Ligand binder design. Structure first.
Ligand SMILES: Nc1ccc2c(c1)c(-c1ccccc1)[n+](CCCCCCc1cn(CCNc3c4c(nc5ccccc35)CCCC4)nn1)c1cc(N)ccc21
Ligand SMILES: Nc1ccc2c(c1)c(-c1ccccc1)[n+](CCCCCCc1cn(CCNc3c4c(nc5ccccc35)CCCC4)nn1)c1cc(N)ccc21
Lengths: 532, 536
């Protein structure tokens, strides 16, 4: 019974487990409950704080994964399976994990809180790519990660009702945040230095905590990797949320809000998941059935509106994208694309993929996208049209929303650092043409190349150390730059004037200017006026 | 006769002519200047199609340039060489339908290819007697026979009340066609080969050449064509029948000829020439640049349909065309009514002035389309750089009016059977008096193609002299063979045809030919495939 593995938190006593990291032991406290299981009548409701417990709670394993759709596009394939649930599925899933140095840090350490992505319909804090181990052991960080409800469970909303007000998955997150504020001190963590970081839907989540006043006193810094609270996919309106909730209710046999939610609550979880794909208004990619809703409660107005008008002066933010944001979404319903062939495409296939990539586009709007993305020297080259189809999806959903977010925060007094991640993992099982797809920087930031038995190159081990240093340096100080190192070159702040960002690849830092500036101007400034 | 130089006495279908022996740097040339090719289009003939010149008696004197067709004399910058070199250099008169011929001295023993020049000036100005259109250098150095004609401009050439018999429109083009007929019948008397005639022209001259290509009765009058910085398609070279009727009618009112066509045209015919010129600007529907009041009309006769339609559905197999542009097509146009611009300062403008310019530069464009133009042309790293905005304003005008129509033209012609050669001219004359910011402006290749640098007394650099020799060879090789390349020469880089596949075109500057690919491809896709659909 190792005294280092015994913590007293507000709700009782905990037993963690000593884990092996390449360079030494870490303490891990996995599966800590932070909310009353949101089950039975509590489905679709705000989470409630976990009641105190007797004795000593076993916090040595990851707990169940929140109920969610399981991907079967390529059964057995590592490139998809690595994102699938690695624990039993259950509605009883509100548990968080904490990693700390062993021994318990002596003095107050910066806390990193991870919020996973998965399009608000999937994900878990227990996947191997979110292993806190290395950041704990190498960088001396306390690193926290929580589960939050996804799909219908987290985000089904009949806006303005009592029983399903929406945004509960975000509320789950906020509860984990309050838990950290209330308990982390006991692990050696520093509640006055909390850095949120997350990817894709996790980044939009972070974005939303930035944009929601009650969340603001629970953290000090934010990192948005490949996702934003603004943009076409991260939110729906109250009208549109009601529509889908109402259509789902119908689809599962449920005939007045109270009546509807009651009948929805009687339904086995898998019934809800069986019918969640079917509520989307159009054939599309990079659109998800149940996402945060603009309720006037959690989100007091649209993110677009909120980012345009907020005051961001005492706020530091790190944002960025991967080289090929859209490639991986193409194999999920764009005719012509597959991981098993080189996916070279006709022009007609391109116009079609654009209607699906930009579901809200009119004929003229779609024709503009097409005309903008065509290479007029090689206007019918199958390689370009493929790379362009990808680019359309990446730019429209991630890169240009990121550019806009970074723009507004800088303008309004936030301190912003931007990046583009351009290294393709050697261990990667997706085809070359996909490049560096959505999600594949995470293993590097988390430092998985430090585990020698994962067969990463020596170059990649070093790169991972550099990235761990940027993220944790940023957590300590709000500046990713190493405060005791020279030469560098330095990573400069993103500003609206200079628009400086850096590339994270195997080479040392290179400073560039303008994040797809011409193209984003099309997406952020033109198209809105067009489809109007 | 008796004591005259026997090389200068030539008979044509209308009678005897006496020419003049002129000194070119390298030797003498023969010139027959001011040959009448039409009945003077005065009095009751104003606005009417031209009638063939009636035979004269005796030996007509053809030693000097004749009158320049009635036109607006530029007064933007009085005394400034930059504008005055384009201004008329003979008396203004409605009696102006004359042409000029330069041939080697002595006239060549065997039939020589003929080059026919058609001046520009926005269809409202110009004269074949300007110093930069001097055929003596091409005549002496390349052994060419060169012809240039006056044709009516402004109201006199292009005022139309479409459907009427008294003012049918396009009569300026018909002047040009009549001179082409003249060349067919008469050019052999000078040693020219009527079976080998190449039209060339710049700006409106180019657009006119294009219209001869698209107008069937003109097709049997020439074999090859060169379009410099202008096209029949595009926003300025033609007007609908409706628009030309509105413009003729409005002008009539302005000069006190109120609204039946016959009565109106009759009253217009009583007006003094200068009152028509004093009022021709006032009929433009918007504040604008690169728009001219009386231009070719789409009449269902000379033009059987819009040039856009005719180039889309034309068969151009048996046709060779050389086409091209200068580096800075739009720059010179900015000083003619874009607030913020001038030749006497660096013309550094603001973002406000740019948006205002775009409205003027693209006058037919809705708010949404103007926004589109501005968004496309903004440099988003420096959306407020004065220098960049100035150069973008220039490019907006350049691309919309010349570069993208040329591209469009080269594209459609090549896809439909034409051998098309394409260029971009990048040399700024060392002698230019327009400010450096204007780059190589609209019109400033002409003096090189005509070989003015060979005149030692014109203060051109030695490099420029060589450059002009080169260009003269390209143009005449093209007249001679339909290929600008020299047969005997050997890389010495080749000029490849422009195709839809490769989109090849050469740079013309002091360095040897460099092949480039894509005549401003992305941006022109904007003007040619996007903007149309936004103004639907
Ligand atoms: N027959 C069905 C029934 C239900 C659903 C269906 C299909 C599909 C679907 C599968 C294949 C082709 C078309 C459609 N889908 C899939 C549509 C969702 C497509 C997004 C997949 C994706 C792709 N990426 C980028 C690549 N890397 C990742 C992943 C995955 N997750 C993550 C999470 C975080 C970061 C990265 C990452 C998951 C899958 C693959 C790659 N993220 N997410 C479902 C979705 C629902 N919301 C509801 C029900 C179902
Ligand atoms: N206050 C008045 C009264 C009447 C007219 C007015 C203004 C103008 C005008 C002058 C200054 C600023 C704005 C408007 N204008 C001028 C309108 C602008 C059109 C001329 C500008 C221009 C500019 N370029 C390019 C530069 N190189 C050339 C030129 C010119 N000619 C040629 C001919 C062929 C090739 C090149 C070339 C003539 C002028 C300067 C440069 N070509 N043409 C008139 C025109 C009419 N048809 C009738 C009346 C008047």
């Amino acid at each position: 019974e190792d005294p280092q593995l015994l913590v007293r938190v507000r709700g009782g006593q905990l037993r963690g487990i000593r884990l092996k990291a390449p360079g030494g032991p870490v303490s891990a406290f996995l599966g800590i409950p932070f909310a009353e299981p949101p089950v039975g009548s509590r489905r679709f409701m705000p989470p409630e704080p976990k009641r105190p417990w007797s004795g000593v709670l076993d916090a040595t394993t990851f707990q169940n994964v929140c109920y969610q759709y399981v991907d079967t596009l390529y059964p057995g394939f590592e490139g998809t399976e690595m994102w699938n649930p690695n624990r039993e599925l259950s509605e009883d899933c509100l548990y968080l994990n904490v990693w700390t140095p062993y021994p318990r840090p002596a003095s107050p350490t910066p806390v990193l809180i991870w919020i996973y992505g998965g399009g608000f319909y999937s994900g878990a804090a227990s996947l191997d790519v979110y292993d806190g181990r290395f950041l704990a052991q190498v960088e001396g960080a306390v690193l926290v990660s929580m589960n939050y409800r996804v799909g219908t469970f987290g985000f089904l909303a009949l806006p303005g009702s009592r029983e399903a007000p929406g945004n509960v998955g975000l509320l789950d997150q906020r509860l984990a945040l309050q838990w950290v504020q209330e308990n982390i001190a006991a692990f050696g963590g520093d509640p006055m230095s909390v850095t949120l970081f997350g990817e894709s839907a996790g980044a939009a989540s972070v974005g939303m905590h930035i944009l929601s006043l009650p969340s603001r006193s629970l953290f000090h810094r934010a990192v948005l990797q490949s996702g934003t609270p603004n943009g076409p996919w991260a939110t729906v309106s109250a009208g549109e949320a009601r529509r889908r909730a109402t259509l789902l209710a119908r689809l599962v046999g449920c005939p007045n809000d109270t009546e509807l939610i009651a009948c929805l609550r009687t339904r086995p979880a898998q019934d809800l998941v069986d019918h969640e794909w079917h509520v989307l208004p159009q054939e599309s990619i990079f659109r998800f059935s149940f996402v945060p809703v603009v309720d006037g409660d959690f989100l007091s107005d649209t993110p677009e509106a909120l980012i345009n008008t907020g005051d961001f002066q005492d706020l530091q933010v790190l944002v960025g994208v991967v080289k090929d944001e859209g490639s991986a979404f193409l194999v999920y319903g764009v005719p012509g694309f597959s991981k098993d062939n080189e996916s070279l495409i006709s022009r007609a296939q391109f116009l079609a993929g654009v209607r699906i990539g930009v579901p809200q586009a009119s004929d003229l709007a779609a024709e503009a996208v097409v005309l903008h993305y065509t290479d007029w020297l090689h206007p019918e080259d199958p390689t370009h049209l493929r790379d362009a189809m990808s680019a359309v999806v990446g730019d429209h959903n991630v890169v240009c929303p990121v550019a806009q977010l970074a723009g507004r925060l800088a303008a309004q007094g936030a301190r912003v650092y931007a990046y583009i991640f351009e290294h393709r993992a050697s261990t990667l099982t997706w085809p070359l043409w996909m490049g560096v797809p959505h999600g594949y920087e995470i293993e590097f930031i988390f430092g998985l190349p430090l585990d020698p038995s994962l067969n990463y190159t020596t170059e990649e081990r070093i790169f991972a150390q550099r990235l761990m240093k940027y993220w944790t340096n940023f957590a300590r100080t709000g500046d990713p730059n190493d405060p005791r190192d020279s030469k560098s070159p330095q990573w400069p702040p993103y500003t609206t004037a200079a628009q400086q960002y850096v590339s994270l690849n195997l080479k040392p830092l290179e400073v560039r200017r303008g994040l797809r500036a011409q193209t984003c101007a099309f997406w952020n400034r033109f198209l809105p006026k067009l489809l109007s």
